[PDB]
Amino acid sequence: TVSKRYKVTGITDSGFIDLSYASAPEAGRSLYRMVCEMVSHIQKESTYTATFCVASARAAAILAASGWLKHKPEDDKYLSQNAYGFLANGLPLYCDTNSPLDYVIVGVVENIGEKEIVGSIFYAPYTEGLDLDDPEHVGAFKVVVDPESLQPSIGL
Amino acid sequence: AYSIELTQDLRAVHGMDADAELSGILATEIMLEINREVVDWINYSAQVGKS
Amino acid sequence: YRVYIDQYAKQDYFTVGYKGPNEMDAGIYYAPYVALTPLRGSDPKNFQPVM
């Protein structure tokens, strides 16, 4: 609901591409052109290098159908285990499997260090001011014990 | 009846303790009223002077 | 005499009282029983505290 829709006159007009199984990876690579172009349309307007990609399962397979998505055993380290693989362009491809689209998003996450952190959808949880057990839990549970039936109720 | 989302705000932004502030104004209010009571049973129960 | 201000007073006045040496000789008895026993809880449906 943020990412600026990428529309080219030839094909993607109407807002998105239509891929058909006819003839070869020629359909599956024809999406890998649109990922590559979206990455260069970040580097024009954003100027950041567009360090990830997100795609629904069915639309990340046809981007895997292109070839040029190489997971492979030795390459595990850089993809942080969440990525479905690396596009040959050097981008991790994060399979979605959730949203109701079949979309392919490109985006950026770059922290140059110190206080400069820039990338889509900044998230940024807030626990500071709360007493937590371990820092990473992002908000604390609470228990109640309803005083009608005494059986507890736990919520975060 | 203070919100659970308040304390976190008020611990973070103001550093004050939330709870311990309400326990501040309730414990003070009752002892102000119980004290405003007896002074108001003295002036209520006192005869009219200079009469 | 020992002059206590009345900080909240509608018109103006002075109420000349009496307090004997005993706690018995007074004219009015303020006898406490329990003192400000705090009570805590939380709203069981929405998890939010009350005190």
Termini Cα distance of chain B: 50
Tokens of A26: 């020629």
Q: What is the DSSP letter of C26?
A: S
Sequence-separated (6 or more) residues with CB below 8 Å from residue A45: A4
Sequence-separated (6 or more) residues with CB below 8 Å from residue B47: none
- Provide the 3-class DSSP secondary structure of residue C43: strand
Enumerate chain A positions whose Cβ falls within 8 A of a Cβ in C: 142, 144-147, 153, 155
Instruction: Yes or no: say if C49 and C43 are a contact pair by the CB < 8 Å rule.
Output: yes
CB contact under 8 A, A153 and C42: no
Q: Which of C6, C36, C47 sits opposite B27 (nearest CB)?
A: C36
Tokens of A85: 């693989």
Pairing of strands A91-95, A52-55: parallel
Phi first, then psi: what are they for A33, rounded to 5°?
-70, -40
Using a CB-CB cut-off of 8 Å, the residues of chain C touching B23 are 38, 51
Spell out where chain A has E strands.
Answer: 52-55, 69-70, 86-87, 91-95, 104-107, 109-113, 116-119, 142-143, 154-155
* Rounded CA separation A54/A97 (Å): 10
CB burial of residue B2 (10 Å; 0-12, 13-18, 19+):
middle
Instruction: Yes or no: say if A110 and A51 are a contact pair by the CB < 8 Å rule.
Output: yes
> By what technique were these coordinates determined?
cryo-EM
* Rounded CA separation C45/C37 (Å): 25
Tokens of A78: 């850089």
**Mutation site, B8, B10, B17, interface A, largest A CB count within 10 A:** B8
